[PDB]
Amino acid sequence: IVYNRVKSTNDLELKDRLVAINRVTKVTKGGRTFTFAAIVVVGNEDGVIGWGLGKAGEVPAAIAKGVEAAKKNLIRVPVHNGTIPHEQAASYGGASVFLKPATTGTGVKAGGAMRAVLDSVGVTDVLAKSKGSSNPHNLVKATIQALAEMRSPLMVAQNRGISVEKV
């Protein structure tokens, strides 16, 4: 279902953004074991966007592993100009997101994980709402799947078999 993309050696414009840092714990007989998990979103300011989770014992190592995983896992999103073709709602775990296209001079009306995802994908005119949990993993995944479920008018006409649906 996802468009997917090979390692973008040519499309090396992938800027990496950090969503959240967490210090998870594991218990053993000796004591407690501490690690670090980072959520990293790589984007080329175009429909290409990837997400990754990097786990390590140190923050730079976790961020690097997240960058690597995000680079490995890439998809393409059908974005026209700085907006989205239509509205779209998505759910992933306890997180629910809703995106609506806005006017050209509106900016991005979102904050946090959704704002990071939208910046990485290169959408600059959208109203975004979160109606579920604020979990970073689920918010990032729900926003990405909302973007992936979109369809431009050309694709709509293509799978409908017609040319102009009075658009």
């Binding site: 073709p85 239509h86 509205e87 296209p101 369809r151 008018p153 709509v156 293509q158 799978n159 409908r160 078999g161 017609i162 649906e165 009075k166 658009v167």
Partner: protein, 131 residues
């Protein structure tokens, strides 16, 4: 049976989700009009009306994109249910998927889509959303 139109939409939706190619529905005049609208707008591959001793059968052949293995129809939603009827004027006609979908609406000029309803300046009962 409580809502034959919702049942028709549900049959189509379940056939699409299961991946079937042909779905058979009991026939009705409004259902025949809806099937004609769907064929005209290009959501279904073909249809056929069979007049047996019963009320009849509508046989619908669905349209699949061989390029992507994706049906032409994504969402079918019933709007005006028996428990809550919805009527709109031509000025407040809904727009589905920002104009990329259709809204089948019954008007005094007949059963049509929101686009021609707006063009002819007639309102009525919003049957369903398709995209």
């Amino acid at each position: 049976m409580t809502d034959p139109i919702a049942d028709y939409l549900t049959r189509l939706r379940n056939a699409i989700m299961a991946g079937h190619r042909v779905v058979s529905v009991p026939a009705s005049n409004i259902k025949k009009e809806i099937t004609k609208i769907l064929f005209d707008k290009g959501y279904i591959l073909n249809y056929k009306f069979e007049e047996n001793d019963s009320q009849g059968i509508i046989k619908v052949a669905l349209k699949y994109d061989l390029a992507h293995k994706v049906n032409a129809i994504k969402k079918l939603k019933r709007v005006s249910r028996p428990g809550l009827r919805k009527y709109v004027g031509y000025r407040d006609m809904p727009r589905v998927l920002n104009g990329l979908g259709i809204a089948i609406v019954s008007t005094p000029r007949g059963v049509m889509t929101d686009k021609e309803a707006r063009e002819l300046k007639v309102g009525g009962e919003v049957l369903c959303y398709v995209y």
